[PDB]
Design a protein around this ligand. Sequence first.
Ligand SMILES: [K+]
Ligand code: NA
Length: 352
Amino acid sequence: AVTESAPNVEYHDVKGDMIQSVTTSFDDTSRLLTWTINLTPRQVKSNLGALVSISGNQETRTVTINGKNAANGAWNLYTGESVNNNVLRITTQVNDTGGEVKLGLRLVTSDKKITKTNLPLEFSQVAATTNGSWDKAGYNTTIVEKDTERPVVNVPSEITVYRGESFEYFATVTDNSNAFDLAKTVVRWLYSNQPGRGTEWLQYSVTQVGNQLKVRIFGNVPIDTTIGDYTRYVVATDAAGNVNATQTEMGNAAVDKTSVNGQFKLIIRFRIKTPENTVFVNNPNQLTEVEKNLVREAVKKSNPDLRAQDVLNSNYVTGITVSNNGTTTITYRDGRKDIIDGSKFIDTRAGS
Ligand SMILES: [K+]
Ligand code: NA
């Protein structure tokens, strides 16, 4: 991008009679800065001289006067043609640090060739030296540092969602520049910029809050989706185009089974629903085998969406286990477990 503005005027000698306006143009890719100075000397004459000083974070690349390269004669002299509505353009390479950049000028016109020795630094000395128009001014502006640092995503290691339920999580994006490319900030699986096979219901949105992005990760999980886990990525881009994780890094991480910044495991779990009818037993803390089986059957009945394929080895008897004290362990097809206390649905028939 190119940014154009009018710099801060540090001083402009009120006896000066040349400078009308000064503008800057900065290319954020080349980091070249052009100072454009428009001149209307009262005495145009034949020769323009420009004594130029720049801050140490700049290095001069080009100086033109009236559209032609200036002859190169802390302060350096450049000379060229003198016309009305003359344009002096000083292009510098800004260093990677950027920051405050400064320009100082002492300008003259003359009918004679101009030399640095015979160049007046005050209005009162003009008549005996260059004997034409004169001006003196200083400017500054501020240039961003070159941003070579990637943005950082903060997202949980695991985002756990439940079949039949909605979810909402946030990832946060921070960058050293405090500026982003929202269009190139996404949540995706590895292969393409999409939510991914099996998780097509994964949604996201990107908002900027202050100096950070907030990436809302949300959706509605179907009752009929596969239980297990999926690797997904928050990929964020700063305003300079640096990304937290590149496509090639995502691919290496997928093969090596390592992590990149912004990676998360999306885990789809089952949400166990409690029996609506109390399971009556003799001693809720010392169940018989028949009572353990009543507990398993009640859990199956209240969870008709828990299919055999959803539990370990597609077997309800080994996938739903019930301890002596009525604790139910459900082990799913992915090896994940729920350990569920029976206190809220198992009761004694004594006193019922
Ligand atoms: K950055
Ligand atoms: Na933006």
